[PDB]
Amino acid sequence: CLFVCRHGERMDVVFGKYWLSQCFDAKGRYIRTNLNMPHSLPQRSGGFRDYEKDAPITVFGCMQARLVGEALLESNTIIDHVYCSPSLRCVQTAHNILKGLQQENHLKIRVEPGLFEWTKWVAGSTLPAWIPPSELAAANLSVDTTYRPHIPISKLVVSESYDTYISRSFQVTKEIISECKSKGNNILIVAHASSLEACTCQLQGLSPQNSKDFVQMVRKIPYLGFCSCEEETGIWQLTDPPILPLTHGPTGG
Amino acid sequence: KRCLFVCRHGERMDVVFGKYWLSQCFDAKGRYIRTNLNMPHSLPQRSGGFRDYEKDAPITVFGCMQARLVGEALLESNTIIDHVYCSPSLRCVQTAHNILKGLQQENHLKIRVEPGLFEWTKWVAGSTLPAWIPPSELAAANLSVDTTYRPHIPISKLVVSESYDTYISRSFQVTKEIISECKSKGNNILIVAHASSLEACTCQLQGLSPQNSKDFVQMVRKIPYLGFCSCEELGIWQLTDPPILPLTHGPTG
Numbered sequence: 179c180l181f182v183c184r185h186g187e188r189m190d191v192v193f194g195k196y197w198l199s200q201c202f203d204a205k206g207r208y209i210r211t212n213l214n215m216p217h218s219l220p221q222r223s224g225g226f227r228d229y230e231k232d233a234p235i236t237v238f239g240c241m242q243a244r245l246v247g248e249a250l251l252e253s254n255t256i257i258d259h260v261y262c263s264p265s266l267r268c269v270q271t272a273h274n275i276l277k278g279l280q281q282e283n284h285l286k287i288r289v290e291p292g293l294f295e296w297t298k299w300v301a302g303s304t305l306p307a308w309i310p311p312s313e314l315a316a317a318n319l320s321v322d323t324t325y326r327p328h329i330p331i332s333k334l335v336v337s338e339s340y341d342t343y344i345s346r347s348f349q350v351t352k353e354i355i356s357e358c359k360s361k362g363n364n365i366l367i368v369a370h371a372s373s374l375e376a377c378t379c380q381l382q383g384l385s386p387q388n389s390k391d392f393v394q395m396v397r398k399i400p401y402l403g404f405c406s407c408e409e410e411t412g413i414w415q416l417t418d419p420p421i422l423p424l425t426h427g428p429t430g431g
Numbered sequence: 432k433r434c435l436f437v438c439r440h441g442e443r444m445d446v447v448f449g450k451y452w453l454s455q456c457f458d459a460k461g462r463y464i465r466t467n468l469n470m471p472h473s474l475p476q477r478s479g480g481f482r483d484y485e486k487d488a489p490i491t492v493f494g495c496m497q498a499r500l501v502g503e504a505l506l507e508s509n510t511i512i513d514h515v516y517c518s519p520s521l522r523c524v525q526t527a528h529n530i531l532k533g534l535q536q537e538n539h540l541k542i543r544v545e546p547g548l549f550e551w552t553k554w555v556a557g558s559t560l561p562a563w564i565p566p567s568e569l570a571a572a573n574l575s576v577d578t579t580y581r582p583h584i585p586i587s588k589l590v591v592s593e594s595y596d597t598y599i600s601r602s603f604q605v606t607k608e609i610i611s612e613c614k615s616k617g618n619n620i621l622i623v624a625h626a627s628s629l630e631a632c633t634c635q636l637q638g639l640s641p642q643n644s645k646d647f648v649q650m651v652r653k654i655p656y657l658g659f660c661s662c663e664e665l666g667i668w669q670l671t672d673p674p675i676l677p678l679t680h681g682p683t684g
């Protein structure tokens with residue numbers, strides 16, 4: 179069985195494309211101005227600019243994930259292997275899920291650029307400056323630095339076509355299921371709203387949807403939205419997920 | 432100085448899951464079965480059983496967290512809270528309670544439940560008040576509620592479909608009665624109530640004629656969950672910058 183899910187709430191959504199203008203001042207000192215803003219953002223090799231295209235989750239986004247994980251704990255769902263997209267937001271999410279499972283120390287996360295979302299969405303001709311696992315583990319994030327990626331950064335393409343994405347996802351997935359096959363029977367993926375229809379489209383075996391009813395079906399996926407597949411029967415299908423959803427509204431006004 | 436802090440309760444069960452939420456988290460024999468991770472681990476039993484919840488519903492999980500955070504935040508600022516009262520709505524007592532829990536003062540501050548801080552009653556459904564849990568019952572639920580507090584406006588003395596002018600007037604008399612009963616016993620006061628409260632309790636406290644009702648309601652709608660204002664004595668009182676930061680997040684989406 180397989181579990182894919184979307185990341186916590188984003189700081190660049192709640193607070194705007196001009197959000198660094200509300201954290202940071204002249205000398206690049208972080209200054210929180212809302213309570214949903216972390217108390218420290220971690221320091222980045224490149225400097226504060228790497229956020230602009232690689233934003234971290236908000237306080238409530240963490241909680242979203244720490245709750246999902248606690249829920250996994252309560253439902254006696256043992257998670258054997260967890261892989262996440264190199265997006266900062268997808269790493270911070272995954273680390274909190276594990277806190278909730280109380281496995282921040284035991285489990286160690288496979289980072290995998292193959293899980294990232296359709297680069298059509300990236301601004302400009304350039305990818306976000308992802309933190310390399312050595313530097314993520316560096317900020318006290320239970321990450322597995324050893325894990326060699328199955329689709330390296332460099333091997334990815336900088337504003338790709340629709341069916342390049344669906345194939346690299348339904349390609350990366352097929353690899354990850356083989357990777358574990360009898361090293362634990364429960365793998366989770368922390369990734370993106372696009373990830374859920376792209377990776378389990380072909381796993382369950384369906385015929386990918388037009389580039390118009392993907393975007394259709396994707397924007398309808400909440401934060402920490404999350405889905406279950408179950409099969410060596412070679413026949414994978416969706417199962418009612420082992421936990422309940424997490425619907426709240428906004429702060430209001 | 433002397434200060435009066437008025438803030439609005441947290442996230443409402445019956446806003447995130449609708450007028451018919453009870454139909455979602457309660458089955459036929461009457462067992463509470465939570466269907467969403469934003470619903471609490473369990474609900475406190477009422478004198479009327481559960482149907483008592485549909486006119487006095489409680490805060491959600493993220494509502495609790497919203498108010499645990501305000502309490503964390505006041506305490507981080509070395510803002511000392513000398514006096515907590517609150518509306519008899521469950522949503523406000525529970526919000527009040529988590530504030531104490533993030534202030535690290537559940538075991539020293541006792542919430543003065545005061546029915547005259549209930550919202551304008553033209554907002555109550557039908558023609559009977561909501562079946563508020565009495566202080567003693569709240570103290571019986573680990574809720575740090577002062578059960579000897581003698582109210583200034585008792586429940587029997589609250590009118591039904593009352594007038595805007597009534598309400599502005601009881602909100603003014605209550606606020607002057609709370610302040611005076613605290614004039615020597617301590618420095619800073621926290622009212623936990625409704626969006627209506629933040630205007631209704633403070634407009635005349637600062638020397639002002641009160642807004643017309645249509646404009647009163649336009650202000651009131653702009654107040655978010657845990658919105659939080661602030662008043663300071665010059666016997667006239669002035670609004671001021673809160674001692675803590677605002678708090679914004681959005682839906683789950």
Ligand SMILES: CCc1ccc(C(=O)N[C@@H](Cc2cc(=O)[nH]c3ccccc23)C(=O)O)cc1
Binds near residue numbers: 449550553625626652
């Ligand atoms: C499902 C029942 C349910 C849910 C939410 C609410 C809600 O949103 N209540 C407001 C106050 C208010 C109440 C009203 O019945 N009518 C209004 C009209 C204008 C402005 C405020 C109100 C608040 O919580 O402050 C009112 C009932």
